[PDB]
Design a protein around this motif. Sequence first.
Motif, short mmCIF file in Angstrom:
data_model
loop_
_atom_site.label_atom_id
_atom_site.label_comp_id
_atom_site.label_asym_id
_atom_site.label_seq_id
_atom_site.Cartn_x
_atom_site.Cartn_y
_atom_site.Cartn_z
N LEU A 85 0.82 -1.01 0.11
CA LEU A 85 -0.16 -0.07 0.19
C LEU A 85 0.82 1.22 -0.06
CD1 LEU A 85 -0.17 0.95 3.55
CD2 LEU A 85 -1.83 -1.07 3.41
N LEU A 86 2.25 1.16 -0.07
CA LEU A 86 2.90 2.30 -0.58
C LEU A 86 3.71 2.10 -1.61
CD1 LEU A 86 3.92 3.86 2.84
CD2 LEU A 86 2.39 4.73 1.12
N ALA A 87 3.84 0.93 -2.26
CA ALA A 87 4.77 0.26 -3.43
C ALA A 87 6.11 0.22 -2.82
CB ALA A 87 4.41 1.09 -4.58
N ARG A 88 6.36 -0.38 -1.80
CA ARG A 88 7.78 -0.24 -1.36
C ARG A 88 8.22 -1.54 -0.71
NH1 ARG A 88 7.89 3.54 4.13
NH2 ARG A 88 6.37 2.44 5.13
N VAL A 112 13.93 0.66 -0.24
CA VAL A 112 13.67 0.73 -1.78
C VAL A 112 12.18 0.71 -1.91
CG1 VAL A 112 13.58 -1.88 -1.83
CG2 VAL A 112 14.01 -0.38 -3.75
N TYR A 113 11.83 1.82 -2.70
CA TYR A 113 10.52 1.68 -3.24
C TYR A 113 10.10 1.13 -4.43
CZ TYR A 113 9.00 5.47 0.43
OH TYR A 113 8.88 6.06 1.44
N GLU A 133 6.82 8.46 -8.09
CA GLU A 133 5.86 8.43 -6.77
C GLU A 133 6.64 8.40 -5.41
OE1 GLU A 133 4.79 5.40 -5.07
OE2 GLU A 133 3.12 6.48 -4.19
N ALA A 134 7.93 7.84 -5.70
CA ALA A 134 8.76 7.89 -4.43
C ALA A 134 8.79 9.24 -3.77
CB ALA A 134 10.03 7.10 -4.63
N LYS A 135 9.15 10.11 -4.74
CA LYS A 135 9.51 11.64 -4.11
C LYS A 135 8.26 12.17 -3.67
CE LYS A 135 11.85 11.18 -7.13
NZ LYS A 135 12.54 9.64 -7.69
N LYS A 136 6.88 11.79 -3.96
CA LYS A 136 5.85 12.18 -3.66
C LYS A 136 5.54 11.75 -2.32
CE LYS A 136 1.94 10.41 -5.53
NZ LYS A 136 0.79 10.23 -6.50
N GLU A 176 8.62 10.21 -0.39
CA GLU A 176 9.83 10.09 0.22
C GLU A 176 10.04 11.46 1.13
OE1 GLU A 176 12.66 8.08 0.64
OE2 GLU A 176 11.90 6.63 -0.55
N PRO A 177 10.62 11.17 2.63
CA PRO A 177 10.92 12.43 3.32
C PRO A 177 11.85 12.95 2.63
CG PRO A 177 11.25 10.18 4.52
CD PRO A 177 11.08 9.92 3.15
N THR A 178 11.75 14.57 2.68
CA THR A 178 12.56 15.58 1.82
C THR A 178 13.82 15.71 2.40
OG1 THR A 178 11.48 17.33 3.05
CG2 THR A 178 10.36 16.52 1.14
N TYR A 179 14.01 15.42 3.52
CA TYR A 179 15.16 15.49 4.25
C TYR A 179 16.37 14.23 3.48
CZ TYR A 179 13.75 12.20 7.79
OH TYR A 179 13.31 11.23 8.34
N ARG A 180 15.50 13.43 3.08
CA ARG A 180 16.52 12.12 2.70
C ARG A 180 16.65 12.25 1.23
NH1 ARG A 180 13.17 7.50 5.98
NH2 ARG A 180 13.80 8.21 8.13
N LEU A 181 15.65 13.01 0.56
CA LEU A 181 16.25 13.61 -0.62
C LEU A 181 17.07 14.28 -0.95
CD1 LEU A 181 12.63 13.33 -1.98
CD2 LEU A 181 14.35 12.08 -2.65
N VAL A 182 17.10 15.52 -0.14
CA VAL A 182 18.27 16.69 -0.03
C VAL A 182 19.52 15.94 0.41
CG1 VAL A 182 16.69 18.42 0.09
CG2 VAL A 182 17.73 17.45 1.97
N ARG A 183 19.53 14.76 1.07
CA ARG A 183 20.76 13.62 1.35
C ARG A 183 21.14 13.33 0.03
NH1 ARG A 183 20.08 10.59 6.53
NH2 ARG A 183 20.36 12.87 7.29
#
Lengths: 60, 129, 134, 185, 144
Positions: free
Chosen positions: C16-19, C74-75, C80-83, C85-92
């Motif tokens: 239910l989150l494709a992950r 892993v997603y 749709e991950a970036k929708k 994902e926690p944004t602090y992990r994305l800027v990491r």
Amino acid sequence: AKVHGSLARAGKVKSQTPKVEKTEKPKKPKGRAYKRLLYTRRFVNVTLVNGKRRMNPGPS
Amino acid sequence: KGRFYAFGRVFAGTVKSGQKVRIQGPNYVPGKKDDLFIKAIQRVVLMMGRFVEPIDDCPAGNIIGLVGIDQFLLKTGTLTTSETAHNMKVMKFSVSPVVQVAVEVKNANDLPKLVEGLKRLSKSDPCVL
Amino acid sequence: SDAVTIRTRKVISNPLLARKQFVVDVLHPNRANVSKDELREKLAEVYKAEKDAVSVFGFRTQFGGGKSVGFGLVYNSVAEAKKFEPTYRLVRYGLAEKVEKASRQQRKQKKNRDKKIFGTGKRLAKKVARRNAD
Amino acid sequence: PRAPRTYSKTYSTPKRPYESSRLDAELKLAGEFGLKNKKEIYRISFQLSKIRRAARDLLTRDEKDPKRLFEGNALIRRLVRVGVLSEDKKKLDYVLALKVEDFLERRLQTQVYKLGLAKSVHHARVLITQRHIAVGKQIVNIPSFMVRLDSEKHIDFAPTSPFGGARPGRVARRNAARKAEASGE
Amino acid sequence: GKGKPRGLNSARKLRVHRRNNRWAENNYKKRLLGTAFKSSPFGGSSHAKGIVLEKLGIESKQPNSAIRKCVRVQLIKNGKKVTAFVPNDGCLNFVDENDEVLLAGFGRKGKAKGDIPGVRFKVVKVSGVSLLALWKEKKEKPRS
RNA sequence: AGGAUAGUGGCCUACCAUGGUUUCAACGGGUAACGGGGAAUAAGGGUUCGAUUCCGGAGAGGGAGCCUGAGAAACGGCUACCACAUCCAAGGAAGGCAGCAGGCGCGCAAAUUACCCAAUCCUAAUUCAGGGAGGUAGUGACAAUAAAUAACGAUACAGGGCCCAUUCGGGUCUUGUAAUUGGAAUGAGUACAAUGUAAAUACCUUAACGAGGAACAAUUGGAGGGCAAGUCUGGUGCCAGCAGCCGCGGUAAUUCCAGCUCCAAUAGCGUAUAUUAAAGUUGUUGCAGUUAAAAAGCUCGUAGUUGAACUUUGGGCCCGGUUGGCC
């Protein structure tokens, strides 16, 4: 005797004792190795009794 | 009551808020351990006429108020952080040590308020003694 | 150097989150203290989704030196991950953008410099124009 | 506005301070295996205290009481999972008969000593806090480990950390730099 | 049974006889009225910030000699005179007149020791340097 | 019997009746009294705190009064008075830190005018906006738990053995001591570097480092008894002083001041004030009362507290349950 704590009697009598300085021993061990001395001195390196034991026999 | 600003002027470095600097005294060389102090500064505030304005950093040649450090200097002060340097001068300034007045509290009880009163009045202004 | 040996445990795929949610065990002899993201780029090949739908945080270095506890996510979706994902992990990871508004002490005073305005304020701005200098 | 986390003290000083042989009885216990203070025989006696306090309350309670049949049987197995005493004294009444120097005997200081390799308990306590020997693979920097009786198959050095191998040191290399300056470049 | 009726309903009468005879000790009677909160110059306190006027001296009884060089110090928090003592040798030259002092008790709970009468209190710190750090001298003595 | 009330009720109002609590302590006064879940010491029996992490109450400078709103007699809402206090053009208008930091006063006494919603939650039309609720940090010996201050060598010397037993000198295992001269072990700091952290600090990691007494360091008390550790040396001589008590100092000070040696605990030790046990010196368990302090001068008597004996004992049948039994 309202003024009887006249400061001519003061720490003067201490100060007329002479001034000397401690002599310098080596580094005593600090920690378990100090007690390593302290057990082996009292209960291993002893051969003296003078009744039962006498740990610091000052000069008799 | 008086938690009085230290009217200071930096001659070197950009001084910073939240900073740890050595403090010295009036006639002192940093060889001995007596009367050099190692503390930190509370706030670095500026002043125009009757108002204040807090800042963060300043380069050399800029007078700033200095908050909270007033406890640890007597009428003059240097506060260094390269401990080989010397004191800044007192110059043997000018006029008027000079005169004497007997001063006494009435009603035989407020001696602590008087002795704290004038030992804080000594740190108030350097002209009087 | 001595087989860093990415091994995976508690491999739980969330439908239910494709992950997937899982705990990484890492035993890394003779060379320690590797990275955030080298282990992902070795993990993202064995799970065959992509290279960068994985979200790690971890490598808790166990005592001694040679063992650690990681935790990757892993997603099963790329964009749709970036929708989610926690944004602090994305800027990491650098794929997204780091935000930069003002700091704390400039924003909350700006709220205090927001209530003093009457409406949109330019009615005052016409009136503080005419008067001063009158 | 938050929840706490607790704390506890895990020793208690003896009451009467100064008896000549009593302090020297715990100098025999100091002198046996190389302690560092007088606190760490106070605390196992403290652990002797509230286990024997725990041991007294089931013995005064009822026979064929399942609280005694649970925490008397689970007590004696945890008493022998550390392996203070063997199967010969497993009848729940030797926990009263337990003596100081037996809680000492399964410490990791005197277990490296008795299993060769160290020659001395004073050399043994050094070989714990110099980032040396593991129990399993888990490195232990604790000279008060209380060996869980299930690594005498496996108690050894570390794979690294010479006197243990896989690199003969780093301070040997400055000693080998003394070779690498006199008869080396 | 000697007095004190053991009967199981009687629990009031041997509670009041317990509480009446509770008023005879040397510490319960003084915790009951707040002896340090109405009497007793230290206001429930191990310490009080002091200020000295000048120096004096008080002599010791029989059998000994050697007047012990006391000090007369008033207190800030209540404003009244009291006498004290400097348990040390020398260092009375170090403690000045009219400067801040910080004093305490003996543990003797009043009831002056055995040597000098009418003196309860001893000196810990003067002007912020704690003169035990001055007799075994390793400390600044400040600019006065 | 009504008036209000969200509804009950002397809650309020008119009339009528004189009633409520009590020698089980009401009433009145005190209280360094927020109430509880607990905490400290601990045979049992308990004594003393609990302002403070959780639940409930009261308050937002001191007493009143009120609107909006489902919810308030709200206080980062209002009105008036008191008491404090601010700005100015003298006309007047702003006012509540027992929120979070911060500064006075009082002080024996108690920390930053930091970062940020990443976490746990919360509010709103509602992922997002927000939250000094909260978390991250610097002060910290308020408290606890783990534990460094150096290892093993070799020589020599005294040896302690064992056996050569004639022991001057031995082989053999072990202690100190004389630092002769080694070879290792590194880690407190230090930092390439990575992690941790949204962000960095720091722990766990990890290159180049980082050790021969002087360093890279252990202090605080004490050495008459109490109570373990000096009949060691020099000093003053009832001065100065020591000391919680007993008591020492008046010329040899096993107590003062130093120096040597030693004791006790060890990253801690004393010191002071309130404490609990030891205090079977408050005691119900469990005190004493002929002389150590105390049995009312003696008796009557209401509460209170105690108060004789007697009323299905026994016999038999059977059923199931448990523990231990040639087994």
